[PDB]
Ligand binder design. Structure first.
Ligand code: ATP
Ligand code: ADP
Ligand code: ADP
Ligand code: MG
Ligand code: MG
Lengths: 513, 458, 52, 173, 52, 460, 85
């Protein structure tokens, strides 16, 4: 059907019409050197720093240095076919990226070119890749919750719209899983999502996209991809492109969520670009401004008050506050949370989720290590019910987990510590959760209810999981109105507490599990 | 009257006629398109060239632009008119209120007060924090510094000190945000405005989004206001949000200024760039400045050149450690490294001094046993080394305290513990009069009566 | 659906061969505003037709 | 490459030549020096480590075309700094500073076929308005471009060729 | 499966558009070079020098 | 016609100056007459002024300044296809055995871009190697990378020969073996050990060993990889062996130092991760075919945090660890089941039964590992009878991981066996869940499937 | 290839007369100012370790005696200094 050759022809026919043949003057230079992806251009007396220089073929380079007699630029693509003497044209444009809600569902190169097969973009103009985040007076305190699918992080480590929450851990610990589950969970909650893949294997990205499409989320995400074989200047500039695409929503009074797949590999690609320019390195051979690199990036994930949205959008949007929520991922060699780049980023974000390999190998997944992981915005970001039921649960587990260190050999006070152990242990057996199985705040809330009110002190550690499955089926059959209510509101009251206690006593009494 | 001739990152080179070359630290100006960019010159190269740092985004600058030589250094509003308002590094107002009605403007580069003018004070300052004013008491008009890695508590501690010292203090106050989060600046501004203390605090903010020149000079912009309030005869509080960023911004620019790297890639002038600032934040015979500085230590390395050179400039140094925070013991102060110039028998009396040194001796003796305990287990200790260990763990617990600014985290209400009320509790724990209580009876409580009262519930 | 689409592709292509020769002329007459005759190109348009 | 180390010497030579109203003699003197630099034997001597005041004198010996005071002094300074090889670029930047001073420019016009000499008149009249400078033209022929014309004036170009129109249409699609 | 089908349709439509698109410019270039002449070339240079 | 002239020579780095408009492009090949033989140079950089800096794919002794240099217009090209099976070649694709010319018809450039995003296979198969330990504890993804961390004296090369055999007979795939910077002595006897097992006609060999200048050791892996790409384009499933990836890193470090670039993390080149990725990203399963890779990895200073191991492990899927111990006990292949791992072991990819079977045998063996610690200090009879059963099942599981290879017959006499995956899952479910408890452990040793273990117990 | 304080008007002086007269070996002129180090042109009779006297009442220590330059460190506040003094 939709291979309407008539439309395919009229499409090109319009272009032949809306095309201007009039001459235009431009400024020109010559490539003088080529090495390891860096270009040295002589001429361009009118180039400006940060500019896009257009090369033969459909390719660009970014002007980094304006030396006295030459321009230094990095090629954004395969550089091998350039040669001394080729002419280059100075476009009057600072580095720019297509932006718009028409990107949703597209897989895109860091320059905005679509790398899937589905043809050109529909986009609302261009945005600058390097910008300065809103000032101190434009922000607003983060208030609204962002729900992942996971009991562990939604209870212990809440994330709010406008927050920045580092996911850090060793390799093969479930970082990408814990991130794309959060992306998938926004499938219906009105938050646009963005996934930036830096230095990832291409097969991994194709599988991630296939799973995003499997669960229906792909229609709500933008995927910006710069694979391991891509130039170091595309890996280094990718997350700025992703942030430029998210600020489009932030500034129009909407919400977005952006995920940087590795900001360790961005730091490594920047270290490459920097050492190839002979810049003196510092600690661990990273440049001096490796902090500023991540700082000026992550400082854009903000929440902005309604006056900023009004003034930016020229008065078209009233009373709404936009936000952009960031989940950068960092990889830590041998569980070292104390190396130059992991600490630089722990020093920028508003918390961190630390995934521990010892817990991950012991089958505890997601392996959220409490005590090291925190949310600097705290409970202000949770729903009223979740804030109530959770309490200080995470420090309760953080205690239980060290108590398991000394109690490993022997223990005194050996009843209260005995019941403390049993409780914490059943709760840990309760927090582990299967991948791709998100659960709404109603389910998490009634499960945390069961856990807190002592309703699980009967059943064995062996039974927990089927207990939860049966409970979530029971309340799915019976109390769907109460679920429809708690999912619609913060939903805490003595009335709802009574309804929950009644559901709990009744299930334990007559239900199968 | 001058031309741009190079643009490398944040540093710009400008060429002037031979007879008109600007002086060092004079401020130039460029029309960066639909913008106005201020440059501060750092070096007079030869032949009329001058090398400058841009106080703003360097992107978009062409070569050959025309720059105008303002013949005076950067100058900021100062005095009573700047009170309760947020300002740039350039002294421009950043909140959406009108112009600053300042009467007078001061250049941000100044000489330190003479050795003749300094003053010294023994007058102790009391804070609600057990560990700080036991192990490291500090005095009115002196310097304090909080050393810590990333995310160990050196901002929460500074907000608690603000709460405990700054509301109960009559004079004015100044808060300089140097290369830290803008979220926290907005949070602090609204806390102050909603508690109606904002009319006593002056705020300068040069946060982490900004380019290197702003982070480089914002600390001097704040010191200039603190110095104006000092010279008026008042006594002032000066809070600096992270002084490490002031040297990091210098490291970022150093190599572009054409200077050879030093020990760990740091600028060769690290100790001088640091001293020239910290020598003018001092109290004097005409007025006093009390200052608290957060000091980031990179990669938790307390021997990195920057913390190592900073240590010498402070009276009381409070050292926060990650290995204590991971135990959930907040504030995570390390009592075997916190120290104070004020901890003398002559200054704090014999009882306070003696209790502090007893605590240090027990905790160090406990550190010495941690390896034998690790290898051979605890049952191999002599019958009294087990007593040392149990008391050391009780003391470790008891140094924890709940804060009014941490309710958002733990829910537990804050506690304010007076000094008289804490040296008594530690004398008790050490002398043995609380062996019956469990360890967890001491965790996150105020006075010692709360511990004996908490033991009743386990 | 895959076999359906592979049939649709030929159905479309064999018509777009009629449009290639029109666009090739309109594009030139946009680039070279001395509008051009078909006659002199009637054979070139035929190889453009063929190679699609 | 000596583009950067030549600027001070060309500027000094030009500022001196102006004070004495000898710009043309200086240009011919530099053009001769930059030629003696290219001889096979002299380019050998310029590379070997001779003492500056010996290399300079052996170089001076090969030129009676230099006004003994001011050209030889320039040679002696450049020799003391070890920069005699920069002369071929001192010449180019001297010509550039001259063309700037006298408000002159030189335009290349590249076309598929030679122009009708009325087109050239209008082109020069137009460019002498685009630029303040009195403009020469160098017409050049290149059959890759197939219609229209390229006007290149310094680092500015006007891509009037139909070849440009085609390559710029292809990338709209 | 029903969204994979649609992705396949979009991709096939795009490849067809790409082919027609490049044949259009190739044809226009051949038409141009087979139909440009001095009477039009002089008119093009006249146009651009009238706005040079 | 030659146009360039050598202008500098410093070690292996040679600079040549061309006419200003004829400058070669990067990675283009050049050649010069180094006396009585030609020498090939590969461009690495373009400096200003028509000068181009190259690295010599050979010894640079005897090079004068001013020699004429001829600019070949294309990168180093090698012969590819069926014609290269059973031959030995060096970096430049020249026959290095004595058997004369290579009768290829097509030659490919060794520098190429990785498969684009829409060429990758939209599926995830498994490569059934036919070895029990590997297919149970560490399955291979078709198109994945496999580390092989064994030391010496454990049979790494006989495992390699067994994989080469199985993927040729039981599949229709060829193999390519790229020898990057290792002992020539080992290469000669790998060639013989393969020629006298009749697999030499199923593998294409390329060698750059330790005696070779740095450029050879650098580009030989790309030569091997492009031959494997030619085989992939035919629609086959191919297997690519790299003799040591660590030496492929170190050759790049040497070359980078020669070019004078600033050093990086622990002395490595600044472009370490990109040099690694541009290789490891070309071996993937494509819609037409696939290249699987088995790569021997050496970890410096036994430090898995060193930049080179850390960068390599970002690409590996599976990981098999050979152990001297498991060989001492007489079990071959000497794979260690407790340290071997594969990120294909997930219910969502390999299935639930296989997952929990592998996890079973893992837990059984890692308990036995400490029951045998008790037995050493306190003697056997100290054990509960709940444990004397675990020991007797662990011993049988441990035996059943042995297998006879078609390549090991020259040692064992017993005929080689190819065990399908289904058979291994059956056998280990059986042994674990107490079935077959009635027959002795030596009925499992070196047997093959379990249906053969019952017979070996019959005739025992 | 980078310059060594060969700058336009100093070169022009030599163009006018290369063998400049020995006008004063006693004095020179500042050509650079940065980070408390100044480069002085002239001072043919400077000695290593010698005190050099600047405008105001300030001094510098001549530490680098090079081919056409003296590198000297200012013993006090330097920002007041300027090229050409
Ligand atoms: N909740 C979970 N339950 C069970 N398995 C999980 C869970 N989360 C992740 N995994 C498993 O962990 C493995 C690795 O996860 P993932 O790839 O997301 O981690 P990663 O840190 O991104 O790894 P890499 O660093 O290699 O990208 C996956 O095979 C997945 O099956
Ligand atoms: N007194 C305290 N009580 C409880 N938690 C605390 C306390 N002080 C710090 N924390 C924890 O430490 C985290 C680190 O926050 P912060 O103090 O801002 O670190 P940084 O010093 O880098 O800013 C806080 O968000 C909180 O989780
Ligand atoms: N499957 C096997 N069957 C029998 N013997 C084996 C087997 N695998 C290894 N061996 C023995 O171990 C030796 C290992 O030698 P080799 O393959 O050269 O190891 P490496 O390459 O590690 O030096 C074999 O020669 C043989 O004696
Ligand atoms: Mg990952
Ligand atoms: Mg902080």
């Amino acid at each position: 059907m939709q291979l309407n050759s008539t439309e395919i022809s009229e499409l090109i026919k319009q272009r032949i019409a809306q095309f201007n043949v009039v001459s235009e003057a431009h400024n020109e230079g010559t490539i003088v050197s080529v090495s390891d992806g860096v270009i040295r251009i002589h001429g361009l007396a009118d180039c400006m720093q940060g500019e896009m220089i257009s090369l033969p073929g459909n390719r660009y380079a970014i002007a980094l240095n304006l030396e006295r007699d030459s321009v230094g630029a990095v090629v954004m693509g395969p550089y091998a076919d350039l040669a001394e003497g080729m002419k280059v044209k100075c476009t009057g444009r600072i580095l720019e990226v297509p932006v718009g809600r028409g990107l949703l569902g597209r897989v895109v190169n860091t320059l905005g070119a679509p790398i899937d097969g589905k043809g050109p973009l529909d986009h609302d103009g261009f945005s600058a890749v390097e910008a300065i985040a809103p000032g101190v007076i434009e922000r607003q305190s983060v208030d609204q919750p962002v729900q992942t699918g996971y009991k562990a992080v939604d209870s212990m480590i809440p994330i709010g719209r406008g927050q920045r929450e580092l996911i850090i851990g060793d390799r093969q610990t479930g970082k990408t899983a814990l991130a794309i589950d959060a992306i998938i969970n926004q499938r219906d909650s009105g938050i646009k999502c963005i996934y930036v893949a830096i230095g990832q294997k291409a097969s991994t990205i194709s599988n991630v996209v296939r799973k995003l499409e499997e669960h229906g989320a792909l229609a709500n995400t933008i995927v910006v991809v710069a694979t391991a074989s891509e130039s170091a200047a595309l890996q280094y500039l990718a997350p700025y492109a992703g942030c430029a695409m998210g600020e489009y929503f932030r500034d129009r009074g909407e919400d977005a969520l952006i995920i940087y797949d590795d900001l360790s590999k961005q730091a490594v690609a920047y270290r490459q670009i920097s050492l190839l320019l002979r810049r003196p390195p510092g600690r661990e051979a990273f440049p001096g401004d490796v902090f500023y690199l991540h700082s000026r990036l992550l400082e854009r994930a903000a929440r902005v008050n309604a006056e900023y949205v009004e003034a930016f959008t020229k008065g078209e949007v009233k009373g709404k506050t936009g936000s952009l929520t960031a989940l950068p991922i960092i990889e830590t060699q041998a569980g070292d949370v104390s190396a130059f780049v992991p600490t630089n980023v722990i020093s920028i974000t508003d918390g961190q989720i630390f995934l521990e390999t010892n817990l991950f190998n012991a089958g505890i997944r997601p392996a959220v290590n409490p005590g090291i992981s925190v949310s600097r915005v705290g409970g202000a970001a949770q729903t009223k019910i979740m804030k109530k039921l959770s309490g200080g649960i995470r420090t309760a587990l953080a205690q239980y987990r060290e108590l398991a260190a000394f109690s490993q050999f022997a223990s005194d006070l050996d009843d209260a510590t005995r019941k403390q152990l049993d409780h914490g242990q059943k709760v840990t057996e309760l927090l582990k959760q299967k991948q791709y199985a998100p659960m709404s705040v109603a389910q998490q809330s009634l499960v945390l209810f069961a856990a807190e009110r002592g309703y699980l002190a009967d059943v064995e550690l062996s039974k927990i999981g089927s207990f939860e499955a049966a409970l979530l089926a029971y309340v799915d059959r019976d109390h769907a109105p109460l679920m429809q209510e708690i999912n619609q509101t913060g939903g805490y009251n003595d009335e709802i507490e009574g309804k929950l206690k009644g559901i709990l006593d009744s299930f334990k009494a007559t239900q199968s599990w | 009257t001058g031309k741009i001739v190079q643009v490398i990152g944040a540093v710009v080179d400008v060429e002037f006629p031979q007879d008109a070359v600007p002086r060092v630290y004079d401020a130039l100006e460029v029309q960066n398109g639909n913008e106005r960019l201020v440059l501060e010159v750092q070096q007079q190269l030869g032949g009329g060239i001058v090398r400058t740092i841009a106080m703003g985004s360097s992107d978009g600058l062409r070569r050959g632009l025309d720059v105008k030589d303002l013949e005076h250094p950067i100058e900021v509003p100062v005095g009573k008119a700047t009170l309760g308002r947020i300002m740039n590094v350039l002294g421009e107002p950043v909140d959406m209120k009108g112009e600053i009605g300042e009467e007078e403007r001061w250049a941000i580069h100044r000489a330190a007060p003479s050795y003749e003018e300094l003053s010294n004070s023994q007058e102790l300052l009391e804070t609600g924090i057990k560990v700080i004013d036991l192990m490291a008491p500090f005095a009115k008009g002196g310097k304090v510094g909080l050393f810590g890695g990333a995310g160990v508590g050196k901002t929460v501690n500074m907000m608690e000190l603000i709460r405990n010292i700054a509301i109960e203090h009559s004079g004015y106050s100044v808060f300089a945000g140097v290369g830290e989060r803008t979220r926290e600046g907005n949070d602090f501004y609204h806390e102050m405005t909603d508690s109606n203390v904002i009319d006593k605090v002056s705020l300068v903010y040069g946060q982490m989004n900004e380019p290197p020149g702003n982070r480089l000079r914002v600390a001097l912009t704040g010191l200039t206001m603190a110095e104006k309030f000092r010279d008026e005869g008042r006594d002032v509080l000066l809070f600096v949000d992270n002084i490490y960023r002031y040297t990091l911004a210098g490291t970022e620019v150093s190599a572009l200024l054409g200077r050879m790297p030093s020990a760990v890639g740091y600028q060769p002038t690290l100790a001088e760039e640091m001293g020239v600032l910290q020598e003018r934040i001092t109290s004097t015979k005409t007025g006093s400045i009390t200052s608290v500085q957060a000091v980031y230590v990179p990669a938790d390395d307390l021997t990195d050149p920057s913390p190592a050179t900073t240590f010498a400039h402070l009276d009381a140094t409070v050292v926060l450690s990650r290995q204590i925070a991971s135990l959930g013991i907040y504030p995570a102060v390390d009592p075997l490294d916190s120290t104070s110039r004020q901890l003398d028998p002559l200054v704090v009396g014999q009882e306070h001094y003696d209790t502090a040194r007893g605590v240090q001796s027990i905790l160090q003796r406990y550190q010495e046993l941690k390896d034998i305990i690790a290898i051979l287990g605890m049952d191999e200790l002599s019958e009294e080394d087990k007593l040392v260990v149990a008391r050391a763990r009780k003391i470790q617990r008891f140094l924890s305290q709940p804060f009014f600014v941490a309710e958002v985290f733990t829910g537990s209400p804050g506690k304010y513990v007076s000094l008289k009320d804490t040296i008594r509790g530690f004398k008790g724990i050490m002398e043995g009069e609380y062996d019956h209580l469990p360890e967890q009876a001491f965790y996150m409580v105020g006075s010692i009566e709360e511990a004996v009262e908490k033991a009743k519930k386990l | 659906a895959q076999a359906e689409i592979e049939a649709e592709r030929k159905r479309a292509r064999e018509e777009l061969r009629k449009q290639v020769a029109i666009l090739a002329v309109a594009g030139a007459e946009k680039i070279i505003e001395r509008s051009v005759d078909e006659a002199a190109n009637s054979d070139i348009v035929d190889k453009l037709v063929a190679e699609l | 490459e000596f583009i950067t180390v030549a600027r001070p010497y060309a500027k000094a030579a030009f500022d001196f030549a102006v004070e004495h109203q000898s710009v043309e003699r200086w240009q011919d003197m530099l053009a001769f020096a930059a030629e003696v630099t290219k001889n096979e034997q002299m380019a050998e001597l310029l590379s070997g480590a001779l003492a500056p005041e010996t290399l300079a004198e052996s170089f001076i010996a090969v030129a009676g075309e230099q006004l003994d005071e001011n050209g030889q002094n320039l040679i002696r300074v450049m020799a003391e700094n070890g920069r005699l090889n920069a002369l071929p670029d001192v010449l180019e930047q001297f010509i550039h500073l001259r063309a700037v001073s006298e408000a002159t420019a030189e335009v290349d016009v590249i076309s598929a076929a030679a122009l009708s000499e009325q087109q050239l008149a209008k082109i020069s009249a137009a460019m002498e308005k685009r630029l303040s400078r009195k403009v020469k033209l160098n017409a050049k022929i290149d059959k890759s471009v197939m219609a229209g014309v390229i006007i290149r004036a310094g680092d500015m170009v006007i891509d009037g060729s139909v070849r440009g129109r085609l390559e710029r249409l292809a990338d709209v699609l």
